Amino acid sequence: NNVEKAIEALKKGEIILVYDSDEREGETDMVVASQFITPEHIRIMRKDAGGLICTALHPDICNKLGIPFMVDILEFASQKFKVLRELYPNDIPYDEKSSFSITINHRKTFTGITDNDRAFTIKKLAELVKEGRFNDFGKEFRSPGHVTLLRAAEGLVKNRQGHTEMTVALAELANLVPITTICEMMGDDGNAMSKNETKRYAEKHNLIYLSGEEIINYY
Amino acid sequence: NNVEKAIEALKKGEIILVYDSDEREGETDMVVASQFITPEHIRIMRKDAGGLICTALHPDICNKLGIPFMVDILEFASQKFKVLRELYPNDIPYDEKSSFSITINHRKTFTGITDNDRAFTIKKLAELVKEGRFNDFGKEFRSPGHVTLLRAAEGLVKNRQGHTEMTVALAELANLVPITTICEMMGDDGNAMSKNETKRYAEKHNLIYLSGEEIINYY
Ligand SMILES: [Ca+2]
Ligand SMILES: [Zn+2]
Ligand SMILES: [Zn+2]
Structure with a gap:
């Protein structure tokens, strides 16, 4: 239903809004399939969303490339930089x-922060994965x-229900490169933009809006 | 006089604009003293600036906190995580x-991304430093x-001239806790907002427009 529409929207390179849940973060994220990312997507994200611009990767891709969790890197590096051991995230509120x-950052970008640079870098990552050029990472x-x-956690929505x-x-589900920004x-x-307020943004912009349970149930 | 003007502005908790040299980054950063940070400050930055919101710390404060360069952490962790080896910063885009x-994120924050959370996280850090409570980090x-x-680099602008x-x-110079956002x-x-547009921005909002080399020369 709504999920199906969301899927079709992603294949067309559009942005969709996704609410996690009232009991968890209670935030709405702007989402776009990374393989279709453009400078315009970023400009719209920094301007109309304002949070951090992040690119989520499927556990399978992370394993083929050997990409670890940041905490695993810091925990290991604490052997030389003790303070990192003190900063361990053992008390995250909304989740474990x-x-x-x-x-x-793409070695080719200048500063890397502009819209052009970030979209370039992100589209490159999604492209290298789709073409299996792991040795070129x-x-x-x-x-x-x-x-x-x-x-993203192993098992996806089965073991963790985050954005x-x-x-x-x-x-x-859309049969795309499992990479999202x-x-x-x-x-x-x-505070975070309210549920009703982001919903309005969705209808007023002809974008599809979803909630956590909807996606989780479809999965 | 132009630098001292920006100084009087910083102490008042105002946002100042700085345009660095054209032979490096050729950009304009919004600047404010971190000890005087507010949710509104973050909001303005994410909406009218759009870049990455960063807090810069004086090298002395970093050494007393144990905070290293992220490159040192990844250089070390590459002993266990091979993916980091092939990402050695040997081709530094600018200086070294x-x-x-x-x-x-301060532990008493929720998602950490909201304007209130990020402002709180920066203000508490300024407070912890000013009160010399480094071991509470x-x-x-x-x-x-x-x-x-x-x-920040050892000797600041004497050995490194970056934002x-x-x-x-x-x-x-402003005799404040040497921490900026x-x-x-x-x-x-x-791309990055051009100098012509930043000047025009500084005018419309009546904010100081300081040059990069001016700050160094005065230092
Ligand atoms: Ca989050
Ligand atoms: Zn989330
Ligand atoms: Zn205090």
Whole structure:
């Protein structure tokens, strides 16, 4: 129904809005299939959403490339930088653990933060995966950079119900490269844009709007 | 006089604009003293600037906190995570190393991304430093988070002339806690907002428009 529409929207390279849940973060993210990302998508995200621009990757891709969770990197590096051990995220409110990963940048980009640079870098990642050029990964990108990556949990929505898993799930259902770029919608009252408020944005912009349970049930 | 003008502005908790040299980044960053940060500050930055919201710390503050360069952490972790080996920052886009450090969220924040959460996270960090409670760092903050920290170079603008050093140097002259929060301004053409547009922006909002080399020369 609504999910199907969302799937069709993704194949056409459009942006969809996704609400997680009232009991979890209670935030709405703008979503786009990374293989169709454009400079215009980013400009719209920094302007109309305002959160962090992140690109979520399916666990299968992360494994083929050896991409780890950021916490695993810090935990290991604490042997030399002790303070990192003190910063461990053992108390995250809305969930057990975060999906944060490393941050990259295309060695070809200048500063890497402009809309053109980020869309370039993101489209390149999605393209290298779709073409199976895994051996060219380390060659095409560097790190750190300005493009933040997220790693979706093994089993997707079965073991974790975050925007990271949900959006990747939708891309899999659409038979696309399981890679998505998401950004949270912030409000003018210093908090996250309300559910009713993001919903309006969706209808007023002809975009499809979904909630966590809808996607999870379809999966 | 132009620099001292920006100084009086920083102490008043105002946002100042800085345009660096054209032979490096050729961009304009929004700048404000982190100890005087507010949700509105973040909101303005994400809407009219759009870049990455970063907090730059004086090298002395970094050493007392144990905060290293993100490149050092990845260089070390590459012993276990091979993917990081092929991403060695040997082709540094600008100077020698990236000023990028770790990302953090104060533990008493919820999602960390909202304007209130990020402003709280930056203000509490300024408070912790000003009160000299360095050993409380891990007690109050967690990593990774939604705010990106930058580590200024030893000797600041004397050894490195990046946005990170110029803005921190200012905080020193202003006799404030040497911690600043910066956001690069993005243009609608997909690139960084040009100097002509930043000047016009500074005028309409009546904000100081300081030059990069002016700050260094005065230092
Ligand atoms: Ca989140
Ligand atoms: Zn989320
Ligand atoms: Zn206090």
